[PDB]
Amino acid sequence: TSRSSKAGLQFPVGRIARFLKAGKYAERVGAGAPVYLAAVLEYLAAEVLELAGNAARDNKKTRIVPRHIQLAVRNDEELSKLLGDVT
């Protein structure tokens, strides 16, 4: 089974492990590091998508468009602080 499956994640642990180990960030990347990072990136995607889907359904739409992401991030203190403005 994949590192992702073991960690309970959709985001790609193997690919993120290869991305870290190729970015020349340190001598070594531990087994846990890409699991933790994949979990963080998955969490941030899941917050944004959960709030942007809510904006879509509130607009009586069946598809997230850029305006829905913009409204999601704007109407969230933390995401606005992190992402700033959505164009």
């Binding site: 309970g8 991305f19 699991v35 933790y36 963080v40 899941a46 997230i64 992190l82």
Partner: protein, 90 residues
């Protein structure tokens, strides 16, 4: 730049099975994920160099998240990171 699009869509189909995403919106999500990957990987690199550490561990990713994300978002990301690593090692 890498593509996380198919993985972003996997998360969408978990949280909102019935809601789609447009190509431009997926583009924005992918640019967001790339941007954060870079920031956390670059900060983890800094932190490991500062303390002469050979290895970026889950501890360096956790400290990187606290140096990069706003406090409240950080606390949630740290809890989700820790939950994953605890499952992975289980």
């Amino acid at each position: 730049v890498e593509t996380y699009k198919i993985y972003i869509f996997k998360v969408l189909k978990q949280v909102h099975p019935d809601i789609g995403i447009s190509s431009k919106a997926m583009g924005i999500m992918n640019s967001f994920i790339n941007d954060i990957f870079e920031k956390l990987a670059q900060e983890s690199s800094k932190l490991a160099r500062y303390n002469k550490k050979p290895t970026i561990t889950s501890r360096e990713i956790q400290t990187a998240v606290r140096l990069v994300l706003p406090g409240e978002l950080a606390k949630h990301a740290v809890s989700e990171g820790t939950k994953a690593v605890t499952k992975f090692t289980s």
